[PDB]
RNA sequence: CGCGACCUCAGAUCAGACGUGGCGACCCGCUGAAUUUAAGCAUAUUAGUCAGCGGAGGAAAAGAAACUAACCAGGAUUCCCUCAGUAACGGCGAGUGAACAGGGAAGAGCCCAGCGCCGAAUCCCCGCCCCGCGGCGGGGCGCGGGAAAUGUGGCGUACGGAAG
């Protein structure tokens, strides 16, 4: 019965709620738990980015957001080939790919070539026969300088 | 007497049946002395018997299996005795061979198309 | 009854051999708990299940 | 050639029997049951020693799966001695007792001073 | 009469030991257990009964496979080899 | 092609043809038992598209289901509620009648697995559907790399589960606006992180 | 009438293998109440909840859009913060109640069938020997058997693809 003013509310706790409390003592061990499978992550992947590939400028969708850029999926294919970059060796060398993206826009189709232009001349390739060189690979020197990227490569502002 | 399995594993066939036997006469002279009632150390014997026993049946059962997957080690099939007993999930499972079998189109993708080992510029 | 099956008949022949007190030398043991046996069943007091 | 009987009864095929490529386990399983396992000791009771010197018997306490047949062999084998017949029954303890009456060729009285008894 | 003198005609039993699980419920007419269902390839067992579960689980017998599964578990379930002797 | 050609051919059901040859079978297979081995596909080209290859180890069955909804089992129709739970004529089974055919089979032969079924005919108490069983220990399955998925015991019974295609039809899943309530991994899994309170270590 | 192929079925203690049962905290498919609440009660609510049934696994399931959207567009699934006690449902009463966008954890992509080409180019099993394997595997060896044109293997799958 309720007394004088007062808010009128509807508590959601009529049915048996007490069975699924999901209780946040698992947090503190949860951040150690991810924090040791990422670290252990970028000491195997060991000259690689620890964020791992370039996301491509995306524009946020419905109409709140849509002034703002993310870190999208991946590149549109019609972004890797005006690069020149090939579908299946982009994965392989650290670029993101999805066949989905499609591009309405040529201002927002020429911003991830250009991206990609800064990525492949910041690209230190090591031989994947290390005592002789072959020829795409980078200078013996790009790969003694070498070191990982902490934080998302080619980090994205507004 | 001491009896111990490390001369019993370096001797013939047919003498641990004659050392068995001569222990199971030995036994069963100390199961009437324990019924009758009579000498106190023909009791704490009785212990030392029965666990030599189960010495002399051991290096019998040993060397009777070590000869068996001496000779059926080089066949196709053996005996379920004489395969592995590990856990039968764990029998179900593909075999180490069965697990390196890629597809032939597997052993192009992964052919042309290498996971390199690359780095960026910061 | 007299009339027995020899499942039953080993059945009561463990209960015969489980109605025996304790020996006098188990509580001069150093770990010494037991006093007496507590688990004695007498054909009186309680009827054995069946 | 005609179908003699209204019923078509299913035709007597063929079978073969079982050639095995390997024993399903590797060795038979040994005689657990020996002559020796099968008599645990002999009873050295005043009624057990009266029908030792009564009546040309022995007194043992047997494995309880034993027959009358393996007992006459177990009595045989053991005490190199004959046996006239064997009379089993279960104790209330749930052991086997085994009144093997020796046949009058070998004596009784004089057979319990081999086994060691009295 | 419905009480005392009735007790005195209980001569005749209906539950004799089950065999599966050794409990004086296999029902004689019916010859299928009260408390296992022996018949039945499947264990009889139910969740309004969680103090009736735990009576009969993996925690009340010997365990005497499942104890040496777990103390082989701790060594990969390793076979055949020996320690290197003296 | 030979297989398109079929293909179109069972797309003319209502056709003299296949009403002619739908109905002489649904015969056949009336006269059959329940639930038994067929020594091929009814349909090469049917069973082509759900997996089958025509190699040794893959298993067809033909079994049987009786026609119509799920009527309530209760004793003389009393339902012991509110006015809601008498409804025990009217009512319909949540599974499709090929997925009760497919865990039919399934259950029957535990040492196969089922990869999918397909319908072969249907008359007013019987629906009939082949379905398609596969081997996970014999070597041309277990040795092929692109069917040696299905001998993990990840896949013990799919079709109890409902992971054949007819299983997952009824789970009511998929992407977009019609599949909110199966949003995460099932209808249960919605149902269950919805009706959680997340009460944090903090507030 | 006979011998032969084949189709569709039997039978075997035939040669090998495999399923069953348990545990069941978590997980998937069904089935499914009434206490209770509405100050009565029947729809609702409790609640797709307890109980019943089947099925797993080390996680399961989901999963690479027959998606979201309406923007200057995003781009598998899963989970967390939020949207939000919001849109909406409801004797519009009691009560119920999502999603997108966004911010993060992780991040991985893919394979057939169909359509077509390559002398079925494919595959299982037995016998023989050889290093050799307590995950029966690699090589040779036989006008040895079988599977298979009622379609096996390669190329190839919506991002297009093949051939010259």
Redesign the pocket.
């Known amino acids: 019965?309720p007394s004088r003013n007062g808010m009128?509310?509807?508590?959601?706790?009529?049915?048996?709620?007490q069975?699924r409390v999901?209780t946040?003592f698992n947090q503190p061990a949860r951040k150690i738990r991810?924090?040791k499978?990422?670290q252990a992550?970028a000491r195997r992947i060991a000259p690689r980015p620890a964020?791992?590939?370039i996301?491509?400028?995306?524009?946020?969708?419905?109409?709140?957001?849509?002034?703002?850029?993310?870190?999208?999926?991946?590149f549109?294919?019609?972004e890797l080939?005006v690069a020149g970059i090939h579908?299946?060796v982009a994965?392989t060398i650290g670029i993101?790919?999805?066949?989905?993206?499609?591009?309405?826009?040529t201002?927002?189709?020429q911003a991830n070539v250009q991206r990609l232009k800064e990525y492949r001349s910041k690209l230190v390739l090591f031989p994947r026969k290390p005592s002789a060189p072959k020829k795409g690979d980078s200078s013996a020197e790009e790969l003694k300088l070498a070191t990982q990227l902490t934080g998302?490569v080619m980090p994205i502002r507004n | 007497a001491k009896i111990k399995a490390r001369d019993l594993r370096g001797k013939k066939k047919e003498e641990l049946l004659k050392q068995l036997d001569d222990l199971k006469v030995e036994l069963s002279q100390l199961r009437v002395a324990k019924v009758t009632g009579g000498a106190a150390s023909k009791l704490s014997k009785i212990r030392v018997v029965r666990k030599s026993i189960a010495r002399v049946l051991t290096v019998i059962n040993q060397t009777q299996?070590?000869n068996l997957?001496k000779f059926?080690?080089?066949?196709?099939?053996?005996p379920?005795d004489?395969?592995?007993?590990?856990t039968?999930?764990?029998?179900?499972?593909?075999?180490?061979?069965?697990?390196?079998?890629k597809?032939?189109?597997?052993?192009?993708?992964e052919r042309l198309?290498p996971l390199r080992k690359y780095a960026v510029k910061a | 009854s007299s009339h027995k099956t020899f499942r039953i008949k080993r059945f009561l022949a463990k209960k015969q051999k489980q109605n025996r007190p304790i020996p006098q030398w188990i509580w001069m043991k150093t770990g010494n708990k037991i006093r007496y046996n507590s688990k004695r069943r007498h054909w009186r007091r309680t009827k054995l299940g069946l | 050639?005609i179908r003699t009987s209204p019923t078509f009864r299913?035709?007597?095929?063929?079978?073969?029997?079982?050639?095995?490529?390997?024993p399903?386990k590797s060795a038979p399983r040994r005689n657990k049951l020996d002559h020796y396992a099968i008599i645990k000791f002999p009873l050295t009771t005043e009624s057990a020693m009266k029908k030792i010197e009564d009546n040309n018997t022995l007194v043992f306490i047997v494995d309880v799966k034993a027959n009358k047949h393996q007992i006459k062999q177990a009595v045989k084998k053991l005490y190199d001695i004959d046996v006239a017949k064997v009379n089993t029954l279960i104790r209330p303890d749930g052991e086997k007792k085994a009144y093997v009456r020796l046949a009058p060729d070998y004596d009784a009285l004089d057979v319990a001073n081999k086994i060691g008894i009295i | 009469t419905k009480g005392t003198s009735s007790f005195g005609k209980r001569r005749n039993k209906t539950h004799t030991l089950c065999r599966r699980c050794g409990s004086k419920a296999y029902h004689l007419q019916k010859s299928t257990c009260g408390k296992c269902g022996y018949p039945?390839?499947?264990?009889?067992?139910?969740?309004?009964?969680?103090k009736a579960?735990?009576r009969?689980?993996?925690?009340t017998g010997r365990m005497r496979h499942l104890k040496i599964v777990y103390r082989r578990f701790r060594h990969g379930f390793?076979?055949?080899?020996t320690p290197k002797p003296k | 092609?030979?297989?398109?050609?079929?293909?179109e051919l069972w797309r003319k059901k209502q056709s003299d043809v296949m009403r002619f040859l739908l109905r002489v079978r649904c015969w056949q297979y009336r006269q059959?038992?329940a639930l038994?081995?067929?020594?091929?596909?009814?349909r090469?080209?049917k069973?082509?598209?759900?997996?089958?290859?025509?190699?040794?180890?893959?298993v067809i069955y033909?079994i049987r289901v009786r026609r119509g909804g799920?009527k309530?089992?209760?004793p003389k129709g009393a339902?012991?509620?509110?006015?809601?739970?008498?409804?025990?004529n009217q009512?319909?089974?949540?599974?499709s009648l090929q997925?009760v055919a497919e865990?039919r089979a399934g259950?029957h032969?535990?040492?196969?697995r089922v990869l999918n079924s397909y319908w072969v005919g249907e008359d007013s108490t019987y629906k009939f559907f082949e379905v398609i069983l596969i081997?996970?220990?014999?070597?041309?399955i277990?040795?092929?790399?692109?069917?040696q998925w299905i001998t993990?015991?990840?896949?013990?019974?799919?079709e109890?589960?409902?992971?054949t295609s007819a299983?997952?039809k009824?789970?009511?899943?998929?992407?977009?606006?019609?599949?909110?309530?199966?949003?995460?991994?099932?209808?249960?899994?919605?149902?269950?992180?919805?009706?959680?309170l997340?009460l944090?270590r903090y507030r």
């Open positions: 019965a009128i509310l509807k508590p959601h706790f009529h049915k048996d709620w069975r999901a946040w991810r924090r499978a990422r992550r964020a791992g590939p996301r491509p400028i995306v524009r946020c969708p419905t109409v709140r957001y849509h002034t703002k850029v993310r870190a999208g999926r991946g549109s294919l019609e080939r579908k299946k994965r993101s790919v999805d066949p989905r993206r499609r591009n309405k826009s201002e927002s189709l998302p | 299996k070590e997957r059926y080690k080089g066949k196709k099939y053996k379920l004489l395969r592995p007993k590990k039968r999930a764990m029998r179900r499972r593909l075999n180490k061979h069965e697990e390196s079998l597809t032939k189109k597997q052993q192009r993708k198309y | 050639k299913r035709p007597k095929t063929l079978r073969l029997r079982r050639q095995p490529k390997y399903r | 039945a390839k499947r264990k009889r067992k139910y969740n309004w009964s969680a579960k735990r009969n689980t993996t925690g390793r076979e055949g080899t | 092609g030979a297989y398109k050609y079929i293909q059959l038992s038994h081995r067929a020594p091929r596909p009814t090469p080209d069973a082509r598209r759900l997996g089958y290859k025509a190699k040794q180890g893959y033909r799920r309530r089992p209760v339902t012991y509620g509110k006015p809601v739970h008498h409804g025990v009512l319909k089974f949540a599974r997925s865990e259950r032969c535990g040492a196969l081997d996970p220990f014999h070597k041309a277990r040795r092929n790399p692109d069917t993990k015991p990840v896949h013990k019974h799919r109890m589960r409902g992971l299983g997952r009824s789970r009511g899943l998929g992407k977009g606006h019609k599949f909110h309530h199966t949003i995460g991994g099932s209808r249960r899994a919605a149902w269950r992180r919805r009706n959680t997340q944090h």
